[PDB]
Amino acid sequence: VEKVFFVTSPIYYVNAAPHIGHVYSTLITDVIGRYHRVKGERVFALTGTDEHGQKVAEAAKQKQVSPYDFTTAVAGEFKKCFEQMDYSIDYFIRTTNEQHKAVVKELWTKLEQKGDIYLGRYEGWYSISDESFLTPQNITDGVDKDGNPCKVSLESGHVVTWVSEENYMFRLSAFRERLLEWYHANPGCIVPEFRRREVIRAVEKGLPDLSVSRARATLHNWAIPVPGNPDHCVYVWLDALTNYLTGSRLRVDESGKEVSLVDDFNELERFPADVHVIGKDILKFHAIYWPAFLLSAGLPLPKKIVAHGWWTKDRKKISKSLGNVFDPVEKAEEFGYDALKYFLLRESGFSDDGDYSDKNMIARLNGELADTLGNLVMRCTSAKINVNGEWPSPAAYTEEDESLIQLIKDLPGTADHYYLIPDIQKAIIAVFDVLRAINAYVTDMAPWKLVKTDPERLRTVLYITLEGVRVTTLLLSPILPRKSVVIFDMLGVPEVHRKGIENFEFGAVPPGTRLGPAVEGEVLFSKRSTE
Template identity: 50%
Template sequence: MYGHQNFVQLFFYPAMFSKLILQHVRFRKELCSFKLSTFTSSRIPCIEKKSASGECISRRTRESQVAFRCLGTSVSHNEKHYLTTPIFYVNAGPHIGHLYSAVLADCLCRYKRLRGFKSKFSTGTDEHGLKIQQAAADAGKDPLVFCTEVSESFKDLFKTFNISYTDYVRTTEERHLRAVSHFWKILFDKGFIYKGSYEGWYSIPDESFLTESQITSSHDKNGNPIKVSLESGHQVEWMKEENYMFRLSEFRISLIHWLQEHPRVIQPERFHHIVLRWLEEDLPDLSVSRQRSRLNWGIEVPGDPEQTIYVWLDALINYLTVAGYPEEHADWSGVTYHVVGKDILKFHAIYWPAFLIASGLPLPQAIYVHSHWTANGLKMSKSLGNVVNPHEKSQRFTVDGLRYFLLRQGVPDTDCDYYDDKIVKLLNSELADSLGGLLKPLHSC
């Protein structure tokens, strides 16, 4: 699909603008019309002029609406394109990292629509698991009430920032429960799920079992020795229980062949190599259920009320739910493109493809991976009080200004640093000065 350079450029150039109009620009002898904005602009009236061919071009400003058109170069066909963000965990409200994923996906989807693709674009919230159960208990609320409140805050964020999704899925919806139960039965009937005893290091924040090679020794804030995940830094605990296992070990070679035969399926390229390095080691079978006595807030394992389905198996199936699984998914399941953060790469590049291979369903066309945002050089965390609230920043820099900043400054294969002075400098130099200066003589012509 797209190489690394094109992947980056694809997200930089379709940034949304409003309020200022670049009426007509000649580029390679083709007449283009598109809207621009800066966070310092106010209002501009409707302008109407004629192109070189005499065609009348009229554009009215409409805040936060993309309008890009290149006359004579439109592409129209009925090819389908199904784009997803990860579904976001509702143990806490949204932050700028969630918005970054959504804006990247939104721009890619808008680009595809402009090319004439019939596009489906999904996002939503992941609402099961031990973290949710604990967060709801800490808040003194029923889990579903808690999930609904946080899910609405994500919807509000996406509405504010003009995320043009076509489907918003919640894992507590009935349609999703049906999809998960059906998918489980397929894997179980094919012999890829079996009941067994599992023990190992478990990270509650990551909702994941880890091997010895994935943990290291550390100390808590009181100086006590603990074990932590090498990848996330979260504390792990030793756990042993009887649950259901997925035969992940049987799919290692198939996954390697898939990645080798499709060298651009994971982008940027360095993440493709990371996954291949992971696959150099044997894959242990994956625990895909939890005892209900420990995790009550989850989807019941079909035929076994004492077990609930592992939150990541549950969550990943959302992509099939939106496609219409199990009744009407065929048109969309083979044209899927995922946008994910690097912290969930393992789940999307190893677990998810293995589940799909086992079920006999098509694999993703591409997995676009992005890195994280830091704040003034530090990892964002509640304890440090440095989590960037996108609603607050949009009040100062406008919705389009913040969208532009994320697209322009975000580099998918490395972490990026956020601080207010950087966004002020960028918007003033590139939008108010450079593009604003370009607009003035064009507007007066």
């Protein structure tokens, strides 16, 4: 089926300034979208801010300013950050948006008409910081920021409070068997596999009904009113998850502003998400509640949920109060935007909790970007080796020649599979496995020597090198968007050959193509010292 490839990030609470976790999640969303655009697909990538709720309302109250002013300011910080990070997200959604508000009321009414919302009570634990209902098995003893004994979440370590409230309840218990059929019938729907097994195990054990409203006082009236009952507000998470539906129904102008909300999602051909990128901390909301709501409402389910891990810096937790900051904009100015992105996507896989150190960052920048990629690009574009600044016409291929060609022809299929899991780390490793192979080839053939000794042989070696670099670069263009453009300019690849599955083929750029001009000082990635 041909639709718009729809990929999303979580919408982030605006209780505090943006940081690495938000940047990382949105990066993964951005990269997936970028890859599908280079395949020549229609793409709609979505990110944004989650602006209602007790968490955020109380964050605003502690800064002594109104929730409207606070959310608008912090949302502004998120937008600025994401612009500075040079992403290619199609739309930034805010849950305070009036059109989203309308979609939530629609979904609610659908759930009610379906017979799946009833008036009950929740009596149990709740984490305001996570906006999460917790069973007693998921809480333990801890200390509040007074240092007094309290209860905390086993999930997150945040303070938990006991809630006892007449609330509208969603019939999640009724959806156990249908969710289990869904997980088994679609064994690639949750990635990575151990998180899928986690979800199945949790749902096997049984599901309780879920509170989808709260008394209005508790939310400091900072929430969407329940249709037909203005004493209740819609659960922040039902509101929040609905952002994906809203996004699928907004017509956006070229400026990035929303202009119109269509009645039926089929009009825009986005819904359901092909990939929801999330962090492991919000798996239940996306893999259990969300599909339950969609099943109730009669809407189609997402194709994949991919859940990544958390970051540490110098093997310590990230927090400004502890004395260990990791600012992405700061590190990107220092080391480079594409390089920082490369590092975040290369150092850790979605199954892992990654670790940034300036040491390891410099190791990769120098080792892989500079010595593997950059070195190769400069050799095959050098006036020394490539005396005519053109793509030569290859002569006969030796067997060693063809072993390398095979690797280059095989690469796109392999990278494609990894990008589709999605497992960006393995995609990158795959591409650099091929770059390392081209380097060893170039060392072996010593093309600097061939300029004088065997110019016909040099033609062959230089051509293979140019083409392996082109193909590897194309496949890395979602990871290194700005640098890929430089590389292609240096190689003189025409614009048309910088996109499309046609150009995944070995040989798409014809011999005789002229390289772009050299600069006196230029290097792609500059090595950095190890202080």
